[PDB]
Amino acid sequence: PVQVNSDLKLLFSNNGAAASSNQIYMNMKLQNTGSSTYDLSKITIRYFYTSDDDKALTYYSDYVSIGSASATFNNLSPVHAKANKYIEIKLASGTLGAAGAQWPSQSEVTIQGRVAKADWTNVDQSNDYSYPGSMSQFGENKLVAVYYNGALVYGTPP
């Protein structure tokens, strides 16, 4: 859809994960480059993917630099060649402060999460819309979408 203006930017990495992986890696830094402040409880992030066959997935919240994160797995509609589902990550609390503001205000938040099945089985990410290939270092992954109060602020949904 239409991307509403904001000063929000997403950096993404996956620990250099290959298309064939034991789990999905999502390491994200959401930055505020401007002078506004943003309420993290209003941020959602979607990582779009294709479900093998509706096997049960679990989201693991390894690290969140401000507040906490939780995830749901959801059907995507309409379906895309590379996605029939999305993970939605919601941040619970805290504030993205203005860029340059004094500690302990912070203008970015780091979110590190993993998605895995329970049955020991691996993931083929070559079929996941949001999988950008191997990204060891934080870079642009425009295939992950960020919303503020439900409005698209970053990335390109399927």
- Domains identified in the chain and CATH numbers: 1-158 (2.60.40.710)
In angstroms, the CA 23 to CA 17 distance is 9
Experimental method: X-ray
Locus of tokens 């830094």: 29
What the block records as the tokens of 7 is: 């000063």
Neighbours of 56 (CB within 10 A): 9
* Spatial CB neighbours of 16, under 8 Å, sequence gap ≥ 6: 134, 135, 136
> In this structure, are residues 117 and 79 in contact, taking their beta carbons and an 8 Å threshold?
no
Give whole-number Cα distances, 115 to 6, 44, 123, 150, in Å. Answer: 29, 17, 9, 23
The DSSP bridge partners found for residue 145 are: 46
* Spatial CB neighbours of 53, under 8 Å, sequence gap ≥ 6: none
> In this structure, are residues 65 and 28 in contact, taking their beta carbons and an 8 Å threshold?
no
> In this structure, are residues 73 and 128 in contact, taking their beta carbons and an 8 Å threshold?
no
